[PDB]
């Protein structure tokens, strides 16, 4: 006779909690600091000496002017960012790899992040796994990793590459560019559509910056704290 | 145990009830305020340097006339839209991919949604899986994924591509076009007949937000009432 | 000592249930509205640019004259239908597919339904599954899908294609024709013998039209209602 | 539980009792009012542009003479029919199919039942399964489907084709003929020796309907009595 009121309290607190959580987002954050810029909004330009390179110039936004938003229209569109403001990137690309030549099965993706005053900022490598002719999808793999083979490839052959806090960019610059060159052999890189670059504002305070980093973890912990305090106060 | 059981039963009961309420709202959902143009009612024009393209002209209905409905005759017919009030597209295409090139079972489908005054509005790519010669169904797959091999190819090889709430098309512009190219190799695309492009009405969010605040409240209230009653009875 | 009388009541009501159900068929329906016309009663004519096409002229039946019946003699015979009466088709074809060339395994059947005053009235596609030399019948498939391999192919490789309410035909026309062209590659189409086209009379009332649609579902629900009301009244 | 058990036991008991009563009625079923002409008692004439054809002339017995019976001597002998009272054929042929062309295990058997004044009466096609080189029996099949491989080929590869209550043959017409062609490829048909063509008497339905109303009543009464007695005793 009480679990109904328990659910009523859930549907009162949880919605109120997310509302107060967005209130904290509104006050603590400007609510438009971060800006997820998908790779497909850059200007792709392939090559052989260098792999796929994504580049896109930068427009400098005078202070006071409302900040535009990088719409995921997949259309090329300049990155917005305050001229007099430090910005800290978060490269988040996930991709598939594939090759007609049954040359190699595991390879090393090289990532270079230049900027332009031409001047390299960040370079790393990540051992990516690559499809090949002699790869077959076992029946048990289809049973366990979801019946849809696209979901199986997502679970098994997709290779996420997260780069956090390692890149910093000034709006006084322009024409950021990210290279992706597989090094051992030519490969077909299938960049997952939801791969982007989170342009953060890099507050001089560690805790709020970490909260901006771990958005989903904050979605967990802040909602949990709100629910617990509200329910304990009411009880 | 109480909260665990209440969450489990809520997760079990929400699907059917929410789908029934969705059907109820769809019955309320107007055919004038929502249209589903089947993709096969466009004009197809195959090619090589550009993928299969679907393009259809547009007729504008002056206000006062009851808005017609795009029938499933599979015959090329014009797309009906209002004079100037704004529509927001929902591409929901799903397709098999197949080839004899024996390129491996992975590829990138480039989607380009143009519009007429020869101008691009939306672009995205989705990793799709493609049939190949070195692919057979295990006896195990047929035993779990339905005995009808069409159903197995459906649960397993179908590329559901849902692009929702991302495209907006002025009624003033005409000749909307959609492109489906494959990036890595020349494939054969088999467009499932129920694939199409919804035309939701992009009406004032102030009403839509309140409608969302009316939708959410109604869904929560109904699901909570039914779930709480049935759970208390079952306890 | 009562289950015997229970079965007596069954063998009294259920035969009386079906008799009164046929009474409702006699009064509500003309008892000769629908007319299942098998494809093999058309005039098959193969081709390469177009697949198998089934065509058959139409004789216009003056009002008052008794309506003929399309006998399943498999012999070519003109379709009967009242000159001054709207008719709504139901394409119900199921088939097998096969190909000596071990090339593709899943294909796309194109269905076109013309009429003649030459003028297209319907077009659709359906992803059909096709046999190929690289297909073997596993022992477990024989154990589970029935020992008879013809029944296994029926359960597994047969692909039904139902088209309901999507076609409308006037008797003032003549020479209906249905095309079936597999598009990707030449295929051997084995049309199942019991495939036809239900020419319905398309009442202006939704409920009776739906009853005519779902003949078997009506066989279930109407008999259930008769049995329940009779048994409850007697009890 | 009562109704469930009564339905289950009825479904179990109907087979044997109904077959025994069918044999009882067959003993009553006259050899003058029912004849079974084995298909091997026709005259076979093989070919290519037309499949294997079975044709037999007809002798008419003036009334008064006791109707002879088509013996199973396997020797070509004429088909006996009455002067003018109408017979209604029941083709029940069942056959294996087999070839070295290694066309895949599926084909279409065209059946044409002609009659003489060179005139067609019935035509149908039935998907049949055909042996091929790439076909072997698993050890599992032999363990379940009888140890005799002839029995396995029977339960699994036999194409039972029953065409009942579809052909009517005037006694005045003579030289009845049956054609068995394979549509896709040249196969070897192995006609099971017990295949034939029944000759039921197409007598007045007014008697047949009442006979059906006498058959149904007797079957229902006997099955109900035995089932009810044995079930009440077993409860």
Numbering used by the authors:
A (entry chain A), B (entry chain B), C (entry chain C), D (entry chain D): 17 to 133, 147 to 264
Please give the exact wording used by the authors of the publication that reports this structure.
As an alternative, we purified the yeast seipin Sei1–Ldb16 complex by affinity and size-exclusion chromatography from a strain that overproduced both proteins from the GAL1 promoter at their endogenous loci. We refined the class with the highest predicted resolution with C5 symmetry, which revealed a roughly 145-Å diameter complex with two alternating conformations of the TM segments that were invisible in the three-dimensional (3D) reconstruction with C10 symmetry. We designated these alternate conformations A and B. In this map, nearly all of the lumenal domain of seipin and most of the TM regions are well resolved with an overall resolution of roughly 3.2 Å. Our model for yeast seipin revealed a decameric complex with the shape of a domed cage, with the lumenal domains forming the floor of the cage, predicted to sit beneath the lumenal leaflet of the ER membrane. The TM segments form the side walls of the cage and are tilted toward the center of the oligomer, coming together in a dome-shape at the cytoplasmic side of the complex. Two ‘switch’ regions (residues 40–55 and 231–243), representing the biggest differences between conformations A and B, connect the ring of folded lumenal domains to the TM segments of seipin. In conformation A, the N-terminal TM helix is tilted roughly 40° toward the center of the oligomer, whereas the C-terminal switch region adopts a kinked α-helix connected to the second TM helix. In conformation B, the C-terminal TM helix exhibits a continuously extended helix through the switch region and lacks the kink found in conformation A. As a result, the N-terminal TM helix in conformation B is tilted further (roughly 60°) toward the center of the oligomeric assembly and both TM segments lie close to the N-terminal TM helix of the neighboring conformation A monomer. The fly and human lumenal domains possess a longer central helix that is hydrophobic, interacts with LDAF1 in humans, inserts into the ER bilayer and is implicated in binding TGs in molecular dynamics simulations. In contrast, yeast seipin has two short helices with several charged residues (for example, Q169, E172, Q173, E184) and a different orientation compared with human or fly seipin, which likely does not insert into the membrane.
